[PDB]
Amino acid sequence: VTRIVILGGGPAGYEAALVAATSHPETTQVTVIDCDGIGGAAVLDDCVPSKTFIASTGLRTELRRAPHLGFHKISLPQIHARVKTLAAAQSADITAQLLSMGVQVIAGRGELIDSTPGLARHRIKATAADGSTSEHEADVVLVATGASPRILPSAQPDGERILTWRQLYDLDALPDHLIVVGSGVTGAEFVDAYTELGVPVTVVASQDHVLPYEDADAALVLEESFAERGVRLFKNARAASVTRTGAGVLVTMTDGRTVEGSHALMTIGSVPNTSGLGLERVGIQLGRGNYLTVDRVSRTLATGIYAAGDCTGLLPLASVAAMQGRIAMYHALGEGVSPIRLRTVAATVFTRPEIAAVGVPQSVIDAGSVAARTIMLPLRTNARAKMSEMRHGFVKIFCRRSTGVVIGGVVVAPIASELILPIAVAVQNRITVNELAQTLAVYPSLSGSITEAARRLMA
Amino acid sequence: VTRIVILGGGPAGYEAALVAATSHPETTQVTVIDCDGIGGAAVLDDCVPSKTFIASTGLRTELRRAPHLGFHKISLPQIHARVKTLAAAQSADITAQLLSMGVQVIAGRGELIDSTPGLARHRIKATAADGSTSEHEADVVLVATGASPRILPSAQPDGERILTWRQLYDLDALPDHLIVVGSGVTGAEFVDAYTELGVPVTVVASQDHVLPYEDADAALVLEESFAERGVRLFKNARAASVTRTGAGVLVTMTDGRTVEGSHALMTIGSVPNTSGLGLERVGIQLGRGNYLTVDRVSRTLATGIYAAGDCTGLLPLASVAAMQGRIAMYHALGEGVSPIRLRTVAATVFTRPEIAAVGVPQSVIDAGSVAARTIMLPLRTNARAKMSEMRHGFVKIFCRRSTGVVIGGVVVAPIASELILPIAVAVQNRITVNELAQTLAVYPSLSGSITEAARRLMA
Amino acid sequence: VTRIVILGGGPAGYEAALVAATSHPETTQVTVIDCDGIGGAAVLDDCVPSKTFIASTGLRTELRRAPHLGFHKISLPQIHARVKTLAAAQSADITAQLLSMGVQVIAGRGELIDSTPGLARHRIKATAADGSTSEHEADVVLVATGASPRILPSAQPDGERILTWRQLYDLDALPDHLIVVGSGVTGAEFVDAYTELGVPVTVVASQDHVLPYEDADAALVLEESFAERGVRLFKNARAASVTRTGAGVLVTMTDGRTVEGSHALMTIGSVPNTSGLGLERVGIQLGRGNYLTVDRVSRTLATGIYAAGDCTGLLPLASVAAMQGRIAMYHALGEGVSPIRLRTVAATVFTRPEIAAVGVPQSVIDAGSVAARTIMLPLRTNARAKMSEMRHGFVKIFCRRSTGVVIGGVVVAPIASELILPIAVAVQNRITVNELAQTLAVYPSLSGSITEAARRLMA
Amino acid sequence: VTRIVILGGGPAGYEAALVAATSHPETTQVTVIDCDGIGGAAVLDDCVPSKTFIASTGLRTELRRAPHLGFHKISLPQIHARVKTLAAAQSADITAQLLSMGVQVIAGRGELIDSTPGLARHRIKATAADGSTSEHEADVVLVATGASPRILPSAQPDGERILTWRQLYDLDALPDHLIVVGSGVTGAEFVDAYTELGVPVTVVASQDHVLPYEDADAALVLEESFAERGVRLFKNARAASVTRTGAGVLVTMTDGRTVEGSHALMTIGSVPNTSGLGLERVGIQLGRGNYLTVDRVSRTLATGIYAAGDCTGLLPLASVAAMQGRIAMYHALGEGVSPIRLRTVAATVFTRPEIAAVGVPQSVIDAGSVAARTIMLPLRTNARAKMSEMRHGFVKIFCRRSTGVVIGGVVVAPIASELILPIAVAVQNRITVNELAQTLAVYPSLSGSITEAARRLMA
Ligand SMILES: Cc1cc2nc3c(=O)[nH]c(=O)nc-3n(C[C@H](O)[C@H](O)[C@H](O)COP(=O)(O)OP(=O)(O)OC[C@H]3O[C@@H](n4cnc5c(N)ncnc54)[C@H](O)[C@@H]3O)c2cc1C
Ligand SMILES: Cc1cc2nc3c(=O)[nH]c(=O)nc-3n(C[C@H](O)[C@H](O)[C@H](O)COP(=O)(O)OP(=O)(O)OC[C@H]3O[C@@H](n4cnc5c(N)ncnc54)[C@H](O)[C@@H]3O)c2cc1C
Ligand SMILES: Cc1cc2nc3c(=O)[nH]c(=O)nc-3n(C[C@H](O)[C@H](O)[C@H](O)COP(=O)(O)OP(=O)(O)OC[C@H]3O[C@@H](n4cnc5c(N)ncnc54)[C@H](O)[C@@H]3O)c2cc1C
Ligand SMILES: Cc1cc2nc3c(=O)[nH]c(=O)nc-3n(C[C@H](O)[C@H](O)[C@H](O)COP(=O)(O)OP(=O)(O)OC[C@H]3O[C@@H](n4cnc5c(N)ncnc54)[C@H](O)[C@@H]3O)c2cc1C
């Protein structure tokens, strides 16, 4: 009976407990210790709440679009009910899954409490919201505590007017004029969301683009998308402060530059939740930025102790958190282990249209660092695209020059988040464009355009 | 120079020409003799249009689902106008590609006119609608004439009340009571589409279900669905005839009972367009079903002569027709060749929800004929599904017992036609559930469930 | 810096160190504490020497086969001198590599001396033959102590007449009548070697054959061979004792009958060198057979503590010992890890001819447990074989029923130990008979038969 | 019943008939028509006779080598008996194989006799040595007639003193001083063979090396080998003439340069046997040099007619002849077809030691045309090498930089012809050095050095 105690039940923590319970039923004993809610911030506060929200926003799009398709009060509070609700329901499903796999699930905060630094088998005191405490022996420990919203002391949030992304679903009415500070992917997604609801938005970006995408082609597509929809924009701006004004907020840059609005949404980074964990008791020193630096097999510098997800700093994606957790267990439980390769991550930006990519960026290729052949197929010639009235979406594919091995791709379409999977497995399993061009994809489908992109790179 | 002449311009033909002219610009001369216009019936008549029609129908589905989301006349002629219009563009895009790729398109009906029956190089005649005629030499000949609606002489279509699916978009008003004769995928799809436009439907099915379907679990999802939305069906009945009554239509079936609707949609099958082609002049004799029996490498029993598409009877899907023309060009132009394997074909029924499958059916695994592990993962626990308010979708993945190689998969969800692709890649490339499980699919998406599906199959 | 201390320097150890120091020059400090000298018994005692001895024997085989080819004193002491001499060089080459790679080699016997039993970092003590002693800290510990000859107290080896295989090269003359006790691979090999030097041999086998062997067809090839060359055997008998007579030796077996030779070679098994290591100080308790039970990832039940080689009892082949040390370094240094699969191990018996096998035995396929296709291709039709005057060699390849993936192979020929490799690659990498069949092996060679073997399995 | 008639039964012809008969038993009818003897020149005159001969030569090597290994009249005619004999026996085995597979086997010369040029089904008149004739209908035709020794009109052979490689086995006594004209692989092999028998040899090379190997390393190994064994050498020499002298031969260069000897062995090229075939009757024009130019799928410019082996000019190796034939049938019979890639050919030079290589040459890599990592492992540190007293053999391996995919290798050892297979399948099936380093090769073996070469390239 090897004991596995996991601090945090978000995706790094939960998907880890799931691999441990499933693969080793009678050999192991898995204990998740989470303070805020199974599914973590991923499910109850950030990722699932933003996507649910964005998803809801869509409707207004397809409504203003029905008359030409032959078919002749937007109440914020209920949209929000759906958000808090679906989020809670996700969390409920996951809590169930864990329980039905023998996973012990405790509500409370965790902390290493090792009597001394060189112990092989560790100890974790779990303190409940119910005041009560409980200690647990652990052969394996996985620190999976996530991150919290970084906060600028010149822009301290309220929940009223200066808001972090978690406070949004607490607003009554749509804002009169939303000011998003911070460009970057999540700042972008909200600019697009609030834009679809009819809310005036002004972005305060660092560089030139409301969102600078490593793939130029797609980035330009969203830029046009934004101008054409009224997004206002401050290029090369750093919020010096965000004070509360008479009726709204006053955002002032470091240039002297200013912009007023009814609300300010702080879309800065996040910070690893890595304090008060006891890491000291076990000899661990947080690396730069306070992340718990981990290796390719998810392990910390102390023995038997693993770390995963946002608290480790690798990549702020729940998918990468899940795999790090999944990996830390395959390693500790003696199974095959394949380190996570940053270039096999599928990442998507949920704007309209979605941008998803996996593999070697086109820049890198256009710099001779990586030889490869490339193709960009415009989705307009595709009949499914046509039925979904897609106008500037395309599929890009990048393969090695000599072998035809798929090494990246970019997709800009309404469901790029799903169309990317196929290219990801190709990159992840050295599949050739020849092999890909061979798969009999469904007609009329957007994915048949993936199949031809590759068919065209054959050589 | 090798002379390629293709009879017929739908997926089989036009995309055999595409491969021909694209990979061998200077060693070939490709001529496509098609009578109805590039894209063939798949694009101009059957496939592209029904999917268009069904996509428009979709809007209604959503729309009145506005309240759950915080929000809150049907003009058939403009839907139809969009149906012809879009069809026309899909056809124009393809013609332009063939044309700029240097393919010689000849609008007309072509036929073989060989002197004796045993020659290497063939001779084809194109007859224009102008009565005019040109003759053409052919080193390689590709018969891609497709199929046509089957017709019951006791229920001859009439364009107004007795309708084939090609005729539906000629109506200027929704039927009062639609009677659909024939259970199958294409009757299933329209019953679903019309039920969504609010039309009453009565099916006269030959089988047990409106949509008989290989995978039981999918079948049920749809059976329960038509039944709730109130679709009426007479199981195991065939229409003895379809007469025209006062203002409606009288359907009479072989058992004597009768039903009455405003219109009757004949949804039987189709017939191969293989007559009057001069296949006699070259020694071929139409096989069972009047089909131009073909190879696994797309060739007929006569040398230099290939066929592909519905006119061969392999499978009536356009995706299969395209690979058949594609593989016939590959075999005739000395390139690498891989025969089509029926169990790699991915196929979807376009209902709401969609149903797609690939590889070994669960039927077989359960009979003991194939040694495999199987899993059925509901989609409702998936956050993305929760967002698209899916409660009955699911992912089924099947795999080899020992090796874990993916051999089949079934997907029932709103975009199954897209998500099936990754599975096909796995099937067509013997990818392993382990291999699939390491792919960092995106979160949150329904495709993440596909990687969990295989993750759990790991052994 | 992570401190690696390896107890024992044979394939398990020295080649765990090699991997250690070669891939992580600056993050590690590798110390190898070995008492007999780098290369261990595999190189200095058992493996390398018998193969050397057998290779010398080979010359005689050939030589008097001079007439068929147009052509046409045995000095045991110089053969033996070549046996020690070559052994010595193999050991010197390895020491030099370890040494220049910066590995700290310490000649001595090492043991665990941990204070309490539950620590992360361990402590080892090396005792020199000088009585001297040094102590060493160990983050990672690798127990690679190998095995020693089993000894029957009623037939204690004496160096002169009662011999273990380690002692054979101490004789200055060929035995008059060699009695070999114990049927097994290592008795089989020596019976063959001595029969070739012209020595009379009488085997007291516990089993049915001198060389009991998994694959029937191979077994026979050798049974017929020993029988023709006149090897004498008492089947199913165990030696009750081995006494020393006048000038020879009296072997008495449990049934009462007796045999008389000049010498007795005890060919029983060996015993794991797992005593006096201080495994108690760390919580381990020797498993069944006094073996240091290990993982599939080479780790013991104590953290930081790994084992590999004969002392674990996985498989007594040096090739298996080396992968065990190799995989223990990979798991401890956070690299990619793939557990050893027993059915990928390739193993050969060094008789004349050689016999090598890999993967599923034909035994199993024939029982119905594994669903496979099999073929046995004699080698005599192969031109190369005709040249090396082989009349009973053959190649057996086994493959998955549906997929055609290679899952086993057996090769009986003069260099089977080399030709088995390609098959192992196929087994270990799920290569397909189709995939193998396209490899342009060389003509003429016996390996061309391997590609035909799979070619015929194609389906 | 598709009819397949093959002109020539060497490896191109025979291995083709074997694939056709085996895969299509009741669908086909296979007819080989060969004039000289099944196995063709490959078996009855060139390749198998030279290897058998070389093999025989070895003995003298290992005899002069026995005294230090502890063991204290070379009649040419019998060595030759073995040669003619084994060659005839090979031929006998193959004739049997064909017969037992339903293949019809006719002795006689073949000729196309097509009534006219555009026939789909061809005709072949077979003329017997027995004067008699016979005609055969053919749906598929495979021209596989091999090549003949090119002959210099200034150096017309005798069979006495000026000899082609086929006349050698007709000599009574070993030559007094053999003069080989022509460097290149086969000229080399004979220099090595006659050298091992004690025969003085003088080579007349074009460039600087008795044999210029694309792999410098190995070439230098043979060069040293030759100087150290007495091979005399004329650098940059072209035989102007080879006249018969008083007692022997007088070879005079174009420089004015001369050298006398007892015999002259003409090792120039060979010429395709492509005359009198009727190729005219079917419209085929021989390409340059009179080769029957074929494509990647083994087909000629006439339909239904395939060509393979030496008569086509691709590569003068029986292995490449076999695959071309094997491929021409897979293509005609509608099976999967994979064109032959010149860079997946394993070629070996049978000298002592053998040189075998497959893949990208090291030159090409050392010219940045191909990025790759490389390694050269000297075989001296290997224990099996040591037992075979190998002194300058090594294993080279070349993998892509980014993926670790094996792309070539060179082996210089006593059985390089067999050790190369494993590297060939790796190159041919994109196997990674990681995968290769994972295969548990047999210890002590030469092939374990292949496994470490790759282990060392991991990254
Ligand atoms: C607005 C926004 C949108 C995003 N959208 C996406 C997206 O579309 N796709 C994607 O892949 N990623 C997305 N991300 C990123 C993704 O949310 C994170 O990568 C992922 O949440 C990190 O998961 P985790 O399991 O490491 O940590 P978390 O999910 O953040 O949770 C760790 C949990 O552990 C608990 N915890 C903390 N300290 C302790 C303690 N001492 N004891 C017990 N429990 C403790 C808490 O309850 C906490 O919820 C988004 C992020 C934001 C902010
Ligand atoms: C209602 C319906 C819905 C469908 N939905 C799907 C779907 O969702 N997905 C899918 O994959 N498949 C679908 N199919 C099937 C798919 O459309 C067919 O498999 C495909 O159309 C066949 O293509 P083809 O190129 O072989 O023939 P076709 O597309 O039928 O066209 C051959 C063309 O050649 C021409 N032609 C005929 N005779 C001659 C001649 N003598 N000379 C010159 N030209 C000639 C015609 O102009 C004709 O249009 C559907 C079918 C129907 C009936
Ligand atoms: C006659 C014979 C023939 C064989 N032929 C083959 C063959 O052809 N192929 C094959 O693959 N295998 C063969 N094997 C088996 C193979 O030799 C073993 O599998 C392999 O030797 C085991 O290697 P190891 O490194 O684990 O241990 P070893 O090679 O046995 O050595 C471990 C070493 O560690 C040392 N040691 C022991 N205790 C301590 C201690 N306390 N501190 C420090 N050092 C210690 C010793 O000096 C010893 O030499 C043969 C075996 C025998 C007996
Ligand atoms: C000295 C020497 C050594 C070699 N060593 C090797 C080696 O080690 N490895 C290797 O791979 N290659 C080697 N080769 C090359 C190899 O021999 C050739 O690649 C191979 O023989 C070609 O085979 P093929 O089947 O195309 O032709 P062939 O084997 O040459 O035979 C064609 C046959 O067809 C017959 N034929 C000709 N015309 C007609 C007709 N009209 N009708 C009927 N039959 C006809 C003849 O009987 C003839 O034998 C060597 C060559 C030489 C000269």
DSSP C13-34: HHHHHHHHHHH-TTTEEEEEEE
- DSSP β-ladder status, A406-413 and A394-399: antiparallel
Selection from C17, C336, A320 nearest residue D432 by Cα: C336
The answer on C414 and C361 residing in a single domain is yes
Residues D178, B417: Cα–Cα separation, whole Å? 75
CATH number at residue C304: 3.50.50.60
d(C-alpha D53, C-alpha D59), whole Å = 11
Given resolution (angstroms): 2.8
Which residue in chain C has the smallest CA separation from A298?
C334
The answer, yes or no, to whether any atom of ligand 3 lies below 6 A from the CB of C94, is no
Q: How far is CA C95 from the centre of its chain?
A: 21
Supply the angle between the helices D76-99 and D47-64 in degrees, to the nearest 10.
140
Q: Does A403 touch chain D (CB under 8 A)?
A: yes
Does C425 contact D446 at a Cβ distance shorter than 8 Å? Answer: no
Q: Residue C2's closest CA among A142, C23, C13?
A: C23
Name the token pair of C443: 């003509």
**Which residues have a Cβ under 8 Å from the Cβ of C103 and sit 6 or more positions away?**
C17, C18, C20, C21, C30, C31, C32
Q: Which amino acid is at B326?
A: R
Nearest chain A residue (CA) to B83: A387
Contact A195, A230 (CB under 8 A): yes
Selected residue of A402, A428, A434 to mutate for chain D interface (largest D Cβ count, 10 A): A402
State the sign of the Cα–Cα–Cα–Cα dihedral B42, B44, B48, B51.
negative
**Owner of token pair 């019309």:** B194
Q: Looking at residue C338, what DSSP letter applies? A: -
Other CB atoms within 10 Å distance of the CB of residue D247 = 10
CA distance A341 to C330: 17
Which residue CA neighbors atom 50 of ligand 1 most closely?
Answer: A47
Maximal C-alpha separation, chain A:
73
Please give the angle made by the CA atoms of C449, C454 and D1, to the nearest 5 degrees.
Answer: 105
B400 interfaces chain C, CB cutoff of 8 Å: yes
DSSP β-ladder status, D133-138 and D122-127: antiparallel
Q: Whose CA is closest to B456, among B358, B364, B377?
A: B377
CA dist B218 and B209 (Å) reads: 12
Q: Which of A319, A337, A355 is the last residue of a domain?
A: A337
User: Rounded distance, CA A355 to CA A215, Å?
Assistant: 9
Nearest to B187 by CA among B177, B201, B200, B173: B201
Query: Of A346, A361, A144, A16, which is closest to residue B444 (Cα–Cα)?
Result: A346
D300 contacts on B by Cβ (under 8 Å): none
Residue B446: HSE in the Cβ half-sphere, 13 Å Cα cutoff: 28
Token readout for B285 is 């004799």
Q: Are residues B22 and B87 in the same domain?
A: yes
What is the Cα–Cα distance from C168 to C183, expressed in whole angstroms? Answer: 17
Q: Which residues pair with D189 in a beta bridge?
A: none
CA distance C113 to C121: 11
Alpha-carbon separation of residue A406 from A361, A446, D384 (angstroms): 13, 19, 41
Beta strand residue intervals within A291-423, DSSP E = 305-307, 347-349, 354-359, 373-378, 394-399, 406-413
What type of residue is D46?
D
Considering the domain architecture, whether residues C15 and C118 belong to the same structural domain is answered as yes
Whether the CB-CB separation of D178 and D199 falls below 8 Å is answered with yes
The sign of the CA dihedral C3, C8, C12, C15 is positive
Q: Is C298 in the pocket of ligand 3 (CB under 6 A)?
A: no
Reading the block at residue C412, the tokens are: 């009986």
Beta strands in D77-186 (DSSP E): 104-107, 109-112, 122-127, 133-138, 140-143, 147-149, 162-164, 178-181
B210 Cα to the center of ligand 4, angstroms: 66
Cα–Cα separations (whole angstroms), residue A39 to A88, A270, A279, A345: 9, 18, 23, 21
- Give the HSE-up count for residue C304: Cα atoms under 13 Å, Cβ half-sphere: 29
* Whether residue D49 has a cis bond before it, omega within 30° of 0: no
- Specify whether the CB–CB gap between B397 and B423 falls below 8 A: yes
On the CB side of C450, CA atoms within 13 Å amount to 34
On whether both D18 and D78 belong to a single domain, the answer is: yes
User: If you search the block for the tokens 């050893």, which residue do you land on?
Assistant: C340
Alpha-carbon distance B204 to B253, whole Å?
8
Whether C226 and C279 map to the same domain: the answer is: no
Residues of C in contact with A335 (CB under 8 A): 339
Domains of chain A: total: 3
* Percentage helix, strand, coil for chain B under 3-state DSSP, each rounded to 5: 35, 25, 40
Give Cβ neighbours of residue B240 (< 8 Å, ≥ 6 apart): B154, B252, B253, B254
Coil, strand or helix at A197: coil
Q: State how far the Cα of D444 lies from the Cα of C44, in Å rounded to an integer.
A: 13
State which amino acid sits at residue A255: D
**CA-to-CA dists, residue B154 to A167, A270, B157, B166, B422, angstroms:** 68, 72, 10, 19, 45
Residues A57 and A88 in one domain: yes
Q: Is the peptide bond preceding residue D444 cis, with omega within 30 degrees of 0?
A: yes
Residue with tokens 């379809």: B242
Neighbour-count burial of A130, counting CB atoms closer than 10 A to its CB (0-12 exposed, 13-18 middle, 19+ buried): exposed
DSSP B404: -
Residues B143 and B194 in one domain: no
**Nearest by Cα to C12 from C268, C338, C340, C267:** C340
Q: List the beta bridge partners of residue B346.
A: B358
- Whether A121 and chain D come into contact, CB under 8 Å, resolves to no
User: Which member of C370, C371, C403 has the closest CB to residue B405?
Assistant: C403
Element (H, E) at B435: helix B433-437
Residue D26's contacts (CB-CB under 8 Å, 6 or more residues apart) are none
Residues of chain B in contact with residue C430, where contact means CB-CB under 8 angstroms, are: 403
Between CA D338 and CA A432 the distance in angstroms is 15
* Of the candidates D302, D304, D303, D325, the residue with the CA atom closest to the CA atom of residue D314: D325
SS3 A221: helix
A73 touching B (Cβ < 8 Å): yes
Structure tokens at D63: 């005899």
Residues A24 and A62 reside in one and the same domain: yes
Residues 6+ apart with CB under 8 A from D224: D392
Query: How many angstroms separate the alpha carbon of residue A388 from the centre of ligand 1?
Result: 33
What torsion, rounded to 10 degrees, do the Cα atoms B275, B279, B281, B282 define?
A: 180
Beta strands in B73-220 (DSSP E): 104-107, 109-112, 122-127, 133-138, 140-143, 147-149, 162-164, 178-181, 201-204
How far is Cα C244 from Cα C264, in angstroms, rounded to an integer? Answer: 9
Query: Nearest Cα to B73, choosing from B223, B197, B227, B177?
Result: B197
Measure the CA–CA gap between C71 and C420, rounded to whole angstroms.
32
- For residue B212, what are the contacts with CB-CB under 8 A and spacing of at least 6? B183, B184, B219
Contact criterion met (CB < 8 Å) for A418 and B446:
yes
Contact A168, A53 (CB under 8 A): yes
Nearest to C119 among A120, A295, A302 (CB): A120
Residues C11 and C326 sit within 8 Å (Cβ to Cβ): no
Give residues after which chain A gaps, C-N over 2.5 angstroms.
72
For residue D333, list its beta bridge partners.
Answer: none
Give the Å distance between the CA of C34 and the centre of ligand 3.
12
Instruction: With H, G, I as helix, E, B as strand and everything else as coil, classify residue B423.
Output: helix
Q: Which of B144, B169, B200, B153 is nearest to B54 (CA)?
A: B169
Q: Please check whether residues C48 and C118 belong to one and the same domain.
A: yes
Q: Are residues C347 and C427 part of one domain?
A: yes
Measure the CA–CA gap between D219 and D382, rounded to whole angstroms.
22
- Amino acid at site C19: V
Nearest CA among C191, C225, C224, C220 for reference residue C205: C191
D51 vs C: CB within 8 A: yes
Q: Which long-range contacts (CB under 8 A, 24 or more apart) does D172-176 make?
A: D172/D76, D172/D77, D173/D76, D174/D74, D174/D76, D174/D198, D174/D199, D175/D199, D175/D261, D175/D262, D175/D263, D176/D200, D176/D248, D176/D261, D176/D262
Whole-number Å distance between alpha carbons of D14 and D103: 10
The CA-to-CA distance between both ends of chain B, in Å, stands at 55
* Same-domain status, C154 and C140: no
Name the nearest CA neighbour of A319 among A354, A348, A362, A289. Answer: A348
Whether the CA torsion A12, A18, A19, A24 is positive or negative: it is positive
Separation CA D84–CA D52 (nearest Å) = 9
- Asked if residue A281 lies in contact with residue A114, where contact means CB atoms within 8 angstroms, the answer is yes
Domain-terminating residue out of C337, C364, C389: C337
Nearest alpha-carbon partner for B29 in B62, B61, B5, B58 = B5
Using an 8 Å Cβ cutoff, are C412 and C382 in contact? no
- Residue B110 has which token pair? 């072509």
Last residue of a domain, one of B214, B239, B268: B268
Kind and range of the H or E run holding A99: helix A76-99
Q: What is the DSSP string of D274-330?
A: -SSS-GGGGT----GGG-----TTSB-SSTTEEE-GGGG-S-S-HHHHHHHHHHHHH
CA-derived radius of gyration, chain A: 24
Beta carbons of C244 and C250 less than 8 angstroms apart: yes
CATH for D399: 3.30.390.30
> Nearest to residue B445, comparing CAs of A411, D221, C252, D208?
A411
Owning domain of residue A121: 1-149+269-337
For chain D, what is the largest distance between any 2 Cα atoms, rounded to a whole number of angstroms?
Answer: 73
Alpha-carbon gap, residue A217 to A215, rounded angstroms: 6
For chain A, the helix, strand and coil percentages under 3-state DSSP, each to the nearest 5: 35, 25, 40
Chain A hits for B78, CB-CB cut-off 8 Å, are: 68-70
For A75, phi then psi, to 5°, come to: -95, 100
Angle, helices D47-64 vs C47-63, to 10°: value is 110
Counting from 1 in the atom list of ligand 3, the atom nearest the Cα of C315 is 19
**DSSP string over B225-293:** HHHHTT-EEETT--EEEEEE-SSSEEEEETTS-EEEESEEEE---EEE--SSS-TTTTT---BTTTB--
Instruction: Decide: residue D168, CB within 10 A, 0-12 exposed, 13-18 middle, 19+ buried.
Output: buried
Half-sphere exposure (CA, 13 Å, Cβ side) for C10? 31
Characterize B372-406 residue by residue with b for buried, 16 or more Cβ atoms within 10 angstroms of its Cβ, and e for exposed. Answer: bbbbebbbbbbbbbbbeebebbbbbbbbbebbbbb
**CA–CA gap between residue B131 and residue B145 (Å, rounded):** 20
Instruction: Report the C-alpha dihedral over residues D352, D358, D359, D364, rounded to 10 degrees.
Output: 10
Cα(C214)–Cα(C396) distance, integer angstroms: 13
What lies within 8 Å, CB to CB, of A405 at 6+ separation is A399, A430, A431, A432, A433, D403
d(CA B15, CA A443): 13
For strand D109-112 and strand C140-143, is the pairing parallel, antiparallel, or unpaired? Answer: unpaired
Q: Are residues B90 and B120 in the same domain?
A: yes
